[PDB]
Amino acid sequence: ATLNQMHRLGPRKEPPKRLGPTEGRPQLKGVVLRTFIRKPKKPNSANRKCCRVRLSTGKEAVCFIPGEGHTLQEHHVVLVEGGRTQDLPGVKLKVVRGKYDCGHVQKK
Amino acid sequence: KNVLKIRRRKMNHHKYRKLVKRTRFLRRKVREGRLKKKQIKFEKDLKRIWLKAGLKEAPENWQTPKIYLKNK
Amino acid sequence: SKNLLKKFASKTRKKFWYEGPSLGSHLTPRKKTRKEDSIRLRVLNGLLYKSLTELLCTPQVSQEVYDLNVELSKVSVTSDFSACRVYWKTGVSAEQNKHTESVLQRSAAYMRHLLISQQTLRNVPPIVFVQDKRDLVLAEVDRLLAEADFGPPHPNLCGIDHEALNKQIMEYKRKKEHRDASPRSFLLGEE
Amino acid sequence: LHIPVMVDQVVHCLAPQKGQVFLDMTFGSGGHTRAILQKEPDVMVYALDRDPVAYAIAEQLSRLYPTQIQALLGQFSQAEALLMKAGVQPGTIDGILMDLGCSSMQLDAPERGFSLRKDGPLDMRMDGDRYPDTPTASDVVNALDQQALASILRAYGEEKHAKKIASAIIQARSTYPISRTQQLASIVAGAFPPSAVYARKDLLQRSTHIATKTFQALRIFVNNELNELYAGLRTAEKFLKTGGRLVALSFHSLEDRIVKRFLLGISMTERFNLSIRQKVKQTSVRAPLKWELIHKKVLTPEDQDVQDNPRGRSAKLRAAIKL
RNA sequence: UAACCCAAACUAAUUAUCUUCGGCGUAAAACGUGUCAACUAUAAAUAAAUAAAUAGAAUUAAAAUCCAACUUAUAUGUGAAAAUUCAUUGUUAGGACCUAAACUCAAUAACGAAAGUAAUUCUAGUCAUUUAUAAUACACGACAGCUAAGACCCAAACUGGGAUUAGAUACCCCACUAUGCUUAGCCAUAAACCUAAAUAAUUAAUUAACAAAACUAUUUGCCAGAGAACUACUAGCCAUAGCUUAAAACUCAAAGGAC
RNA sequence: AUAUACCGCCAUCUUCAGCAAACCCUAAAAAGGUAUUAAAGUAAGCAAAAGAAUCAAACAUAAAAACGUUAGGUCAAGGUGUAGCCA
RNA sequence: AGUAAAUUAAGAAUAGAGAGCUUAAUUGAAUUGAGCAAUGAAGUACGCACACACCGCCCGUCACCCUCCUCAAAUUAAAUUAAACUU
Numbered sequence A: 001a002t003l004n005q006m007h008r009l010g011p012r013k014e015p016p017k018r019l020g021p022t023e024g025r026p027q028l029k030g031v032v033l034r035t036f037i038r039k040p041k042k043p044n045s046a047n048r049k050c051c052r053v054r055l056s057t058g059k060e061a062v063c064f065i066p067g068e069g070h071t072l073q074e075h076h077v078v079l080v081e082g083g084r085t086q087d088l089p090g091v092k093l094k095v096v097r098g099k100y101d102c103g104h105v106q107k108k
Numbered sequence B: 001k002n003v004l005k006i007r008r009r010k011m012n013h014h015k016y017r018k019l020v021k022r023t024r025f026l027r028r029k030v031r032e033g034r035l036k037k038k039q040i041k042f043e044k045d046l047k048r049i050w051l052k053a054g055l056k057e058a059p060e061n062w063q064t065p066k067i068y069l070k071n072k
Numbered sequence C: 001s002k003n004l005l006k007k008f009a010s011k012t013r014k015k016f017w018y019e020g021p022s023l024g025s026h027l028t029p030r031k032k033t034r035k036e037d038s039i040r041l042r043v044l045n046g047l048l049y050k051s052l053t054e055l056l057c058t059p060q061v062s063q064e065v066y067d068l069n070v071e072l073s074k075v076s077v078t079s080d081f082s083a084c085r086v087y088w089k090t091g092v093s094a095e096q097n098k099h100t101e102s103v104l105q106r107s108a109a110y111m112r113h114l115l116i117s118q119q120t121l122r123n124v125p126p127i128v129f130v131q132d133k134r135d136l137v138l139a140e141v142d143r144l145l146a147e148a149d150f151g152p153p154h155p156n157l158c159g160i161d162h163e164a165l166n167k168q169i170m171e172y173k174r175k176k177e178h179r180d181a182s183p184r185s186f187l188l189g190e191e
Numbered sequence D: 001l002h003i004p005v006m007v008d009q010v011v012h013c014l015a016p017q018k019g020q021v022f023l024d025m026t027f028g029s030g031g032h033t034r035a036i037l038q039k040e041p042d043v044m045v046y047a048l049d050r051d052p053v054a055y056a057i058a059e060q061l062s063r064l065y066p067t068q069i070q071a072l073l074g075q076f077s078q079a080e081a082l083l084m085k086a087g088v089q090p091g092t093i094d095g096i097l098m099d100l101g102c103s104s105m106q107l108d109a110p111e112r113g114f115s116l117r118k119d120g121p122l123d124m125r126m127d128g129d130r131y132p133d134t135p136t137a138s139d140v141v142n143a144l145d146q147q148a149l150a151s152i153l154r155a156y157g158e159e160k161h162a163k164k165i166a167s168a169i170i171q172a173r174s175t176y177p178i179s180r181t182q183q184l185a186s187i188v189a190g191a192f193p194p195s196a197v198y199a200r201k202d203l204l205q206r207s208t209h210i211a212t213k214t215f216q217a218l219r220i221f222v223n224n225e226l227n228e229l230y231a232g233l234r235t236a237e238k239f240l241k242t243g244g245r246l247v248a249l250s251f252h253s254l255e256d257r258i259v260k261r262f263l264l265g266i267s268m269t270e271r272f273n274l275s276i277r278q279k280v281k282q283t284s285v286r287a288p289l290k291w292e293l294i295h296k297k298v299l300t301p302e303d304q305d306v307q308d309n310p311r312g313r314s315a316k317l318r319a320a321i322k323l
Numbered sequence E: 001u002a003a004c005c006c007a008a009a010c011u012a013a014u015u016a017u018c019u020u021c022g023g024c025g026u027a028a029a030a031c032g033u034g035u036c037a038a039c040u041a042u043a044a045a046u047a048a049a050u051a052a053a054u055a056g057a058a059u060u061a062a063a064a065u066c067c068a069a070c071u072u073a074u075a076u077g078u079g080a081a082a083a084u085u086c087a088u089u090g091u092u093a094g095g096a097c098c099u100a101a102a103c104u105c106a107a108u109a110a111c112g113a114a115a116g117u118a119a120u121u122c123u124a125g126u127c128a129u130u131u132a133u134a135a136u137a138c139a140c141g142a143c144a145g146c147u148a149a150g151a152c153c154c155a156a157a158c159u160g161g162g163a164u165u166a167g168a169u170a171c172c173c174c175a176c177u178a179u180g181c182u183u184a185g186c187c188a189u190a191a192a193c194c195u196a197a198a199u200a201a202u203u204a205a206u207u208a209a210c211a212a213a214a215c216u217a218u219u220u221g222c223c224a225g226a227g228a229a230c231u232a233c234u235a236g237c238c239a240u241a242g243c244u245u246a247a248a249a250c251u252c253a254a255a256g257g258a259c
Numbered sequence F: 001a002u003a004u005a006c007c008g009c010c011a012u013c014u015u016c017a018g019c020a021a022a023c024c025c026u027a028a029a030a031a032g033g034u035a036u037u038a039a040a041g042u043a044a045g046c047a048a049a050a051g052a053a054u055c056a057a058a059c060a061u062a063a064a065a066a067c068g069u070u071a072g073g074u075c076a077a078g079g080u081g082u083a084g085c086c087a
Numbered sequence G: 001a002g003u004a005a006a007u008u009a010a011g012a013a014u015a016g017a018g019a020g021c022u023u024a025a026u027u028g029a030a031u032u033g034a035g036c037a038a039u040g041a042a043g044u045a046c047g048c049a050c051a052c053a054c055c056g057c058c059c060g061u062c063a064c065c066c067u068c069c070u071c072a073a074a075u076u077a078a079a080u081u082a083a084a085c086u087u
C-alpha cells in the first residue's frame, strides 16, 4: 500500500477476542446432569469418561473427567476448568479433581 | 495446475441450485412477505418525520409511493 | 499487444525443437536414445516426403519416370541414417508394379542427385524403393486362389458346473443321511 | 390374483387361429394358456410345467376344453420326450410360449418356500413330489462351501456382495440348520449393518430387501432354470414350424441374455469382458441371422401396470419367427 | 527407581503484555470495460493521417432448401447393427428463393475501451486534454435466458424412437422442438484470463522454483490460514428458481504454489 | 510357544545385470553426473566374464550366479534368544 | 538333437517294502516365421489430485446419534424514547 493509503486506513483492524467455554473466567461451578462415554475420533481408540453439567451461568456443557476412575453421579457439584480434550471433539471443558464432590484419583 | 478448488465450488453451486429448486415455492412466499415488511418500515419511517416536525397530518396531496411492489 | 502464437509457442518448442549447435552422430554418412534424434529424423522424413514427391511427379528425373507419376505411400529413414526406405504406392496389377519397381530403382542415384543439387537436403544417404509387404501378400493370396482348384462341383455355459455342485450337495446329503539416529549415543560418550 | 403379464402382446403376436397347433412350456397357473384359448376356441394347444401342482391345474382346466389343451408334466429338457411320447401331433408347432419365472400360485403359497416375506420351509423348488430327491434350497445353503455358494449368488443372483453374504450363511448354518425362508433372509441381512437391510432401492423407485438376490440365486440354482432354459429354447426351435412365431418373457437379465442371444444368433458360450478395453467400437460372424424378429424391440410393462404386478416389472417380451 | 527444574512455594485454568513501510502471473489479492471530480504526484506542449472499430443502406459467389423434368429400386445410417425411408434417390449449362452463414486470401496480426470485429460497395465515423489517479454518476458489455411480433436453410438443449450395458435417465444412430436469425426492450453474467492495473525510467551498480529476464518511482484498487462461503442476513436493481454487495457461529492444523 | 528374535541350509525373480565403497563436479544437490570427430566424471572390489569339470579338440551340458525382493520355507536335522513345564 | 518319443539296466535307502527318485545305455524323429494385432518385459517420450503407491485415490443421493446456524406463522415478554404549549 502507498503512504497515502496507509494514512487513510491507519492500523489494521483487530477482530475481537471471542470468549470460550468458561466465558473468560478461570473456573465455573456446575451440577452434573448425566454421565456418559464419548468415543475419540480416529486414529485413537478408547471409552473416554465425560459428563454433562449445568454451569453457574445457566448453560449446559460437556466436560471431560480426567484420571483413572471417578465416583461422579447426577446432582453432584464440580468445578470445571478450561482446556480442550484433543481427541474428543466439542469437549472444551474439564473437571477439577479434588474440589467439591469430585475427589482426587485413588492412588494404586 | 489442478482444478481442485474449482471442483469444490462446482459442487457447492450444484447442490445449492438443487436446494433452491426444491424450495422455490417456499422462497417465493418468504420474499413477498419480506417486501411487505420492507414497505411498512418505509411508510412508518416517513410518518415519523412529519409527526416529529409537528404536523398532525401528512403534507397535503402526499401519498407514500409503493416502491417495493410489482410496479414494473 | 495480443499474439495468438504466444499460447502455443512454448509448447511446440519442446516437442518440435531442441537447443544447441549439435548434429547427431547418425546424420553423418558413416546407442542411447535421445529426444533430439526423434526431431532430427522426423523433419527429414517430412522433407524427403515433400522433396521426393517433387521428383516423381515432376520432369527432372526422366521422361518415363515423369510419366510413371509415382505417388508415395510413406518415407522413413533408418535411425542409423545408413540409408532410406522410400515406400511407394502399389497398384493392384502385380506385373506393372514389378516393372515400376525396376524403373524407380534405376533412377535412385539420379533422384538423390536432384535433391542434393537443389540444396533442399545437403547430405542425403542412399535411397531405396520398397513394396509394402501387406500389399504383396494380399496380391499373392489372390494369385494362388485363382490358380487353386476347388475340386469337382449347459453347466459350462452359465459358468458353474451344476453337475459337480450337485455331487457336492448329494455327497453332503449322503453324509447327512527415527529414535536411534539422535545424538544421544554421541553426546553420552559411547564411542 | 396375478393377471398374465403382457399377455395381450403375446396374444397379438401369436395370433392364435383355427387349425394351428401351439405349445406352452410353462403352463403354471394357466393364465396365459387360457388367454390363447379364449381368442380362438378352435385352436390346438399343448401345455407343460415342472410343477405337478401346475399340471393338475391344466388337467382340471382340460375339462373346459377337452382337446384344445393337452396337459403335460416335466422340465424343459424333458419336454422333447414328453412331446415325443405324444407323437407327431404337436409336429410343426405354430408357436411356443416360453414364459419364465415363478408361478403366481407357487410364490403366493408360503409352504412352497419361494417367498422371503412370508414364513415357510426353505423348499424353493418348483418340482413337487414328482422327484423327492431333488435338493431343496435348504440343502443347497447348508451343503455348499463359500466358493460354491458365492458363485450361485454372483452368477445367478447377480449378487454384488457375494463373499460377505456367502460367509454369513456358512457361519449361520453351523450354529443352526437353515430351514426357514425368514431365517435365511435374516442371515443374509446380518452380513451387513442394520442400515442395509431394506436400503437397496430399485429402478422402480421402490425399496426392496437386501436378500432378494439370494432368493433369486437359490431359486434358479435349485431348479437349474437357466441351464434347462437353454435346452427349452433349442427344443422349441426343433419343434417350431417354419414361419412359426416364438414368444418369450424374460423377467431378469440372465434369462433375457439367453433369449436375447439365442434369437439373434449369439451364443451363451460367449466369453465375458470385464470393464477394461471393451471393444464396443474398434477405433465377423460365422453365419447370418436365423430369425425374423417381429418385435426385436423390447419393453417392460407400463409403470402404472407394474404397480399392480411388481413381480413382472422386468418382463421383456422377445418375439421371433423361425427361419 | 533414579535424575531434572523451580522453591516457601509449585503446577493448572483464565487474562493481559509483542500490533500496518508486507504482498497482489502460478500460493489470499489488478475490479469485464471506458469517461468526467477532489487530492497526491509528474512536466510537456501534440494528435491523427484507407489492413477485419461502429452504425445505416444496397449488393452476392459457393453450398443448401423448395418446385419441375428425367430417373435407379432402394435410400439413409454404424466399429457392427437397428430404427428411419422408397412422399426416397441420382442428374439438370431448368425455375424459384434471398433464409442462414461468409472457403481460399489468413504461413496475415490489423481495428476497437473492453466485449468484439475479416464476402463486396457506398455514406457517416475514430484525431490534439502534459501524464498517472474515480464512484454513490453516466455509457457499454460474448454466450445462455426472459418479453412481443416475424423469420426458418442448416444446427440443436428437451423430448420420442433405435442400439449398447448388470443398469445407461449417457457416450453412438434417427426424427423433431426451445434456441441460435430480424426488429423493439430487458437481463448484466464468463477460465469477461496476456490468469501481466496504468504511466515514466534503467539494463548494472539482478537467478526461491516455474512462467513472461530483473527492477525503481508515482497514483488508485485489492489481500491478511483453510473450510463453512459464488452461503445467511442487509440494501439497490425492468432482475422473482436472478445479479451485485457479503458475514458469523462451528470444524480443522493445516490448506495452498513450484519442483 | 514364537521361522514376526535367529544361526545353519534353501526356494523365487535368475544365467536377470547389476550391488556396494572411496573420491570428484553442480549460480544447491529432493538428486544427478553421457556425447568417441567426445561436453564431468574417475580409480579399485563382488557378480558376470575368464577359468576349471564331463580324462584330445571344440560345441554343448552341468556347475556358477552378487546385492536385494516375497517378515518366502524350515524352532520337528542340529544349535540357540525370549517366554513356559519340572509328581 | 543324439533332444523329444519309445525301450532297457543299475543304484541309493530297507530285514522286507514305490507304479517314486538318482544315474547309465539303446533306437531315434517332426519342426523353427514375409513374426509383434494382442500378452509380458526392456528402452524413449508424455501425463499423474497415486506414495498403503490403480487391489490407488476419490465424488454425490440415502441411513442414526451429536454440535452450530438460518428461516418462519403467530403469541406474549420485557424493554427504549421525546418533546408540543397556555396563563
Ligand SMILES: Nc1ncnc2c1ncn2[C@@H]1O[C@H](CSCC[C@H](N)C(=O)O)[C@@H](O)[C@H]1O
Residues within 6 Å of the ligand: D004, D025, D026, D027, D028, D029, D030, D031, D032, D033, D048, D049, D050, D051, D054, D074, D075, D076, D077, D099, D100, D101, D102, D103, D104, D106, D126, D223, D224, D225, D228, D229
Ligand atoms: N425348466 C422349467 N421347465 C418347465 N417348467 C418350468 C421350468 N422353469 C419354470 N417352470 C414353470 O413355468 C412357470 C413360469 S411362471 C408362471 C407362468 C404361467 N404361464 C402361468 O400362467 O402361471 C411356473 O409354473 C414354473 O414352475
Ligand SMILES: [K+]
Residues within 6 Å of the ligand: A043, A044, A045
Ligand atoms: K493411537
Ligand SMILES: [K+]
Residues within 6 Å of the ligand: E193
Ligand atoms: K486465458
Ligand SMILES: [K+]
Residues within 6 Å of the ligand: none
Ligand atoms: K532363516
Ligand SMILES: [Mg+2]
Residues within 6 Å of the ligand: B008, B011, B012
Ligand atoms: Mg461443499
Ligand SMILES: [Mg+2]
Residues within 6 Å of the ligand: none
Ligand atoms: Mg489466487
Ligand SMILES: [Mg+2]
Residues within 6 Å of the ligand: none
Ligand atoms: Mg432414448
Ligand SMILES: [Mg+2]
Residues within 6 Å of the ligand: none
Ligand atoms: Mg426451430
Ligand SMILES: [Mg+2]
Residues within 6 Å of the ligand: none
Ligand atoms: Mg464477476
Ligand SMILES: [Mg+2]
Residues within 6 Å of the ligand: none
Ligand atoms: Mg475473450
Ligand SMILES: [Mg+2]
Residues within 6 Å of the ligand: E230
Ligand atoms: Mg455466479
Ligand SMILES: [Mg+2]
Residues within 6 Å of the ligand: none
Ligand atoms: Mg447469492
Ligand SMILES: [Mg+2]
Residues within 6 Å of the ligand: none
Ligand atoms: Mg441475499
Ligand SMILES: [Mg+2]
Residues within 6 Å of the ligand: F003, F071
Ligand atoms: Mg521368514
Ligand SMILES: [Mg+2]
Residues within 6 Å of the ligand: F064
Ligand atoms: Mg561363471
Ligand SMILES: [Mg+2]
Residues within 6 Å of the ligand: none
Ligand atoms: Mg512367514
